Amino acid sequence: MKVDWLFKNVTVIDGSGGPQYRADVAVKGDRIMAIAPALDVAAEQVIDGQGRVLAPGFIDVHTHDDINVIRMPEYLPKLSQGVTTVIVGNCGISAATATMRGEVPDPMNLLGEQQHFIYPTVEAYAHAVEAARPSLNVGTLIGHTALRNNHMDDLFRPANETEIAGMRVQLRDALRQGALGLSTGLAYASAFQSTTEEVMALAEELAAGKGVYTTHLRSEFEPILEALDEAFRIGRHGNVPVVVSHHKCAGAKNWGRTKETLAFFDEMRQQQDIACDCYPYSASSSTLDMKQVTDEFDIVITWSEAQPEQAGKTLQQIADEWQVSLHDAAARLMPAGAIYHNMDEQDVRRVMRYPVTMIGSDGLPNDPMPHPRLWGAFPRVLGHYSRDEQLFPLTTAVHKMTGLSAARFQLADRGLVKIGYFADLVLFDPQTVRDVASFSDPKRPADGIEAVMVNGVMSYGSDKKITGRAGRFLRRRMD
């Protein structure tokens, strides 16, 4: 057969976590059409893949790209990492189905401003995505807080029955239109007052395979076990799978406690379906907030409106230079952004190695000085953690950003190098793949990503130029 693309002599890491092997892989249209020890076929395009890995396109299961992927369809921060699908609508906030009857509630402002929320149904969001012709695929969760906001006159209280019944119906229609499930962000003020019962009511719409429950826990600090217990209870009430978003033990007092949380996962996964994702860094990044100020670890200023030349220094250094207290120095920097070294590297590694842990970047594309995970999460797992630190073999590393993720979120025919699946594919050099993005210089494309293919269209390459606009809106696999 004449094929469109032939990948010769590649090490296939097929996304299942199984062993690797060498083969030729052929693509025709948007489908992987053949895999064999060799394929003696004429192709429009041939790539000698010797010495490279052919993997499924990476699936970023934790993004806030809802609106930005439409505004910047040639979505370089993710595509240059090898990402071919983004899952949007996380932590309780989604553009899809969100109507703004007034002020935009925190943290929906991470996605955009009031005027950008013009997608009152999943259907409307889907067609807006495809009108933008993005370079990677998009699927969406439905944001719990966005639903709250559609139905409640004020967010800072438990919802009443009538409000919750409305939310159930709106979520049902969204899942019918292909939404992948429901996200919560229960630690945020705008959802913190919700009861477990309210969330249970919405999670019930997910039963019988209609989606996954993903959750930013009600707390990622001291009471994290209690918050984990609530998530699992919600999962058991609805009989729905749970994904714990960006699982971490934050704060010096909780360092080492992933030994406890993952033990809780072990125990509870014996009776229900639970997974999680994490980003592969032990520092967080946010606005500089007085309540976060501490001398327990480095706080590094990323930018400061009040004193822009202090960026790059630690809060302690700045306080010492100014001869003031940490809090006084904080006040004099604000408004500012900061990196918080408030996670323990061993915790992050324990969570990354946990068998059901997926990789998500949790990138924030509207941040003025972005955390480098926005540009580096996936090559950082393949290069720094798998190759250099040997946290897991490369087949496992790829598994955690492809087949595992596609299965958990019910993406049809994606996440595996498999005959008959869609041709979302990454060709990368395993010896040189690496996250170039750094905290001081975050907006930098990875190295070692040699070709990225989306729905059979070659879209990105070693010259760092985008050449395809073949992304689609992905609907949940229906039964």
Count residues contacting Ni ion (CB under 5 A)? 4
Given the complex with Ni ion, which of 76 and 187 has the nearer CB atom?
A: 187
Piece of 82-90, 98-106, 194-202, 278-286 that binds Ni ion (CB under 5 A) = 82-90
Given the complex with Ni ion, which of 90 and 219 has the nearer CB atom?
A: 90
Given the complex with Ni ion, which of 20 and 245 has the nearer CB atom?
A: 245
Judged by DSSP in three states, 278 sits in strand
Q: Which residues contact 405 (CB under 8 A, 6 or more apart)?
A: 59, 61, 277, 358, 359, 411, 415
Distance of closest approach, residue 240 Cβ to Ni ion, in angstroms:
19
Given the complex with Ni ion, which of 185 and 379 has the nearer CB atom?
A: 185
Q: Which residues contact 309 (CB under 8 A, 6 or more apart)?
A: none
- 80 in contact with Ni ion (CB under 5 A): no
Name the token pair of 271: 């009776």
Distances (CA, A) of 68 to 16, 63, 145, 167: 30, 10, 19, 26
Distance of closest approach, residue 236 Cβ to Ni ion, in angstroms:
22
In the chain, breaks (C-N over 2.5 A) are found after none
Distance of closest approach, residue 132 Cβ to Ni ion, in angstroms:
22
Task: Single out the residue of 308, 309, 307, 285 nearest to residue 298, CA to CA.
Answer: 285
Piece of 83-91, 142-150, 283-291, 454-462 that binds Ni ion (CB under 5 A) = 83-91
Given the complex with Ni ion, which of 90 and 314 has the nearer CB atom?
A: 90
Distance separating alpha carbons of residues 243 and 216, to the nearest angstrom: 9
Given the complex with Ni ion, which of 23 and 88 has the nearer CB atom?
A: 88
Distance of closest approach, residue 457 Cβ to Ni ion, in angstroms:
29
- 148 in contact with Ni ion (CB under 5 A): no
Given the complex with Ni ion, which of 80 and 90 has the nearer CB atom?
A: 90
Residue owning tokens 């941040």? 367
Distance separating alpha carbons of residues 89 and 107, to the nearest angstrom: 12
- 285 in contact with Ni ion (CB under 5 A): no
Given the complex with Ni ion, which of 216 and 218 has the nearer CB atom?
A: 216
Distance of closest approach, residue 106 Cβ to Ni ion, in angstroms:
12
Burial environment of residue 103 by CB neighbours within 10 A (0 to 12, 13 to 18, 19 or more): exposed
Given the complex with Ni ion, which of 90 and 140 has the nearer CB atom?
A: 90
- 373 in contact with Ni ion (CB under 5 A): no
The dihedrals phi and psi of 358, each to the nearest 5 degrees, come to: -90, 160
x/- letters, 444..473, toward Ni ion (CB under 5 A): ------------------------------
Residue 286: alpha-carbon gap to chain centroid: 17
x/- letters, 87..116, toward Ni ion (CB under 5 A): ---xx-------------------------
Distance of closest approach, residue 83 Cβ to Ni ion, in angstroms:
15
- 380 in contact with Ni ion (CB under 5 A): no
Residue owning tokens 């239109």? 177
Residues 188-247 that bind Ni ion (CB under 5 A): 216
Distances (CA, A) of 45 to 48, 71, 80: 10, 31, 21
Task: Single out the residue of 128, 170, 130 nearest to residue 146, CA to CA.
Answer: 170
Distance of closest approach, residue 174 Cβ to Ni ion, in angstroms:
19
Distance of closest approach, residue 108 Cβ to Ni ion, in angstroms:
12
Distance of closest approach, residue 90 Cβ to Ni ion, in angstroms:
4
Distance separating alpha carbons of residues 235 and 207, to the nearest angstrom: 9
Residue owning tokens 């960026």? 311
Answer for the pair 299, 251: CB distance below 8 angstroms, yes or no: no
Residues 347-366 that bind Ni ion (CB under 5 A): 362
Distance of closest approach, residue 140 Cβ to Ni ion, in angstroms:
13
Given the complex with Ni ion, which of 217 and 311 has the nearer CB atom?
A: 217
Give the footprint of Ni ion on this chain (CB under 5 A).
Answer: 90-91, 216, 362
